[PDB]
Amino acid sequence: GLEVLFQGPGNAIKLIHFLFRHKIIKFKTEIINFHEAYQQFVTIYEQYDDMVQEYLEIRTLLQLIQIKITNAQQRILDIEQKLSLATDHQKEFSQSLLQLKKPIEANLQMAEKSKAGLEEKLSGLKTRLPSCIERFNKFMTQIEINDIKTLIRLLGDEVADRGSCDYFTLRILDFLYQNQIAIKIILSNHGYEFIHAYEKLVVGQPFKPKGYIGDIQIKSFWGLQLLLEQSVITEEELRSLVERAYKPTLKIIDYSLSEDGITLYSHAPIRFDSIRMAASQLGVTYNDSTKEALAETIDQLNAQLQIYMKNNMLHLLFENNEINDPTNMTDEERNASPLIYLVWNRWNESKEVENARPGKYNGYFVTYVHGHDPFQSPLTYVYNLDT
Amino acid sequence: GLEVLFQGPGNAIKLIHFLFRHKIIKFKTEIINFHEAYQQFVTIYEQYDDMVQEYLEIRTLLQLIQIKITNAQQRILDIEQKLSLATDHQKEFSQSLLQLKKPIEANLQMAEKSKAGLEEKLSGLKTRLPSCIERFNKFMTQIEINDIKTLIRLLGDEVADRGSCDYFTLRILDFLYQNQIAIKIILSNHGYEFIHAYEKLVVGQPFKPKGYIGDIQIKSFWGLQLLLEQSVITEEELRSLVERAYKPTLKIIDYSLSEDGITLYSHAPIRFDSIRMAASQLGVTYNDSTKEALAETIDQLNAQLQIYMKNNMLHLLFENNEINDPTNMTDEERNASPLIYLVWNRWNESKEVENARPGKYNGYFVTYVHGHDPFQSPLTYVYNLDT
């Protein structure tokens, strides 16, 4: 079989860049100017990403301003409650209370005006959104599938914004799914953050800002919220997209078998013994005896990921506030939260020790392929994806 | 008239030390051994202060442990809610959930045992308390008033624990009040903290730990809470003590008139123009023309302090989270919260400028007496109390 590696799943331009480069997709021959259409997509994505950024900031500013308003209104009415109870001979006290109110009524006036200005910018954003999505939907009619026989493994970008799972990325993953492309995404810390945020959006009552948030600081949550709020997409539309084209691709760890070896695909560099630790946490009986046994254990890990995910319980696996440095977890911490180690670990010289990552085990070869990590192992059977 | 200066109002030993030294109080001649009775009071106070300290710590530890318990119980029952919904073929998922519960049930067991140990120490504290107060009440029967013709100004200690307003200090202030001693306390930041905490204790429903607290970190609040909880004193008893012997002594600023001058008593060193700023905040018409006018303005400031205090509104005067450094407030900040400046300001070379503190004004001399401050002004008419 033919296979390629990417980081991702986003951002949209990187993913499009990569799909063109490996001849997975191509412009339909009916397009008059390939370069012009390509540049239009870049512009569209840069326009959409700016709008989501502005929306997040406006929304952050409106949350803080409403705090300012509610605190001022409370303090004024508390003072008003006291004035109403004063006596006829406490005339200095009444004047004192008026003095105290005057700056609060000033701040309240100021905050109400800032809010109005922010709601002005927010409504202007919302008139620009539909045509931007309209232009993206047009771009999506201009491409067609090409090579359908190539498997895509997305090992996850190590930084947030560069691999972010915006709405465009989601629509591209659906395009590949509708065209029968085999896609596998190795779940990362950012992948978990995305799923966690998405579950908030598709549960009733529909999410209203604001709000328990908070954050939801990730940009991919905000753009979906913007699209839902402006009726660009429906909750049924979004659930459909995520359940059919994104969730069924997710793996904790992935593999491929050769005649006498196994290749292990992960997001972070990981020790071989991390797999057993994960099987323990997920209730899977760990079998190491043969490469087929190990593959069968991994399939069951991924089957359990789907169960936790279908039950909205991923946070139990991927959130542990007690861990000090998830990138350099202690052995006690590795046992405690194996899945956090799998997506956060960063390698260094101290971890490049014999038996960390054997190249031969229980009679079969082992090969390790993982997303980008600054440390460069000299082991010939370790593959460290570039950025 | 005869007048003396102290910091205070506490702590109890310092205040007792000071009252003996200035012959305000003395042992009754029926006491067989003055030194022995004195040492017993020191022991009693050291015993009581230790008990209040232990109580605060135990109470702080129990608040944190109850957080640990409630969070563990919630996480276990959330998982139990999920187990009850699993299917017959999700057998790895069930085992996974049990695995996840086991460390939480461990922490819950550990936290419940720590709580039991803390409640063990707390009950042992509570058996020692009544006899300690009993021994203090005995000491209070062993002294009598001496010189009744001396006015006591308490300018406030600059640090918390050294001038703290424990129950013993309160009882001593009542003793002086019942014996017709003229007492004036210049309100400090610590004085405000004390009043603020006390208002929590005497309002229904009676304060139950815990609780919105929080803190209430001041020790003087905790010892009163301990005494009330163990029925050593009643809310009516405590309200009586504070309303009759403490609150009527409180001044924002105090004065004394000579034939041609005024002396200004404050807790912190303050600029002369801070008085007008305070009159503005309290609704008092500021008159500066003569020393009698200024005295009359100050009497009205103090009358307004009593109104704010009788209405439980002191926090409006003495809490401003926007101020950056209350010890070095900007002029804009001084205008904003004059009373915060009056109790927090610390002097330095940059503030020792002509016209800051005139020694002659509108035809009368001015003299400044304030609580301890590291900076030592060479002005002959500024008196900086020692520690």
Author numbering:
A (entry chain A), B (entry chain A): 24 to 410
Quote the authors verbatim.
The protein, however, degraded into shorter fragments, the most prominent of which had a molecular mass of 46 kDa. Mass spectrometry analysis of this fragment yielded a sequence coverage that included amino acids at the N and C termini from residue 34 to residue 411. A construct of this core domain (termed “WipA411”) was therefore produced, expressed, purified, and crystallized, yielding crystals diffracting to 1.84 Å resolution. Its structure was determined using the single-wavelength anomalous dispersion method applied to selenomethionine (SeMet)-substituted crystals of WipA411. Residues including nine residues of the N-terminal His tag linker and the protein sequence up to residue 410 were visible in the electron density and were therefore included in the final model. The WipA411 crystals contain one molecule/asymmetric unit (AU) and no metal. The first is between the tip of the α-helical hairpin of one molecule and the globular domain from a symmetry-related molecule and is observed in both the WipA411 and WipA435 structures (and interaction details in B). This interface includes five H-bonds and one salt bridge covering a surface area of ∼550 Å2. Overall, all proteins including the shorter WipA411 elute as dimers.
Here we describe the crystal structure and biochemical properties of WipA (or IcmW-interacting protein A; lpg2718), an effector protein originally identified because of its dependence on the IcmSW complex for translocation, but for which the function is unknown. The crystal structure reveals a two-domain structure comprising a metallophosphoesterase attached to an 85-Å-long α-helical hairpin forming a coiled-coil at its tip. Although WipA exhibits a serine/threonine phosphatase fold, it functions preferentially as a protein-tyrosine phosphatase (PTP), even though there are no structural similarities to the general PTP fold. The protein forms homodimers in solution, and the dimer is mediated by the tip of the helical hairpin domain.
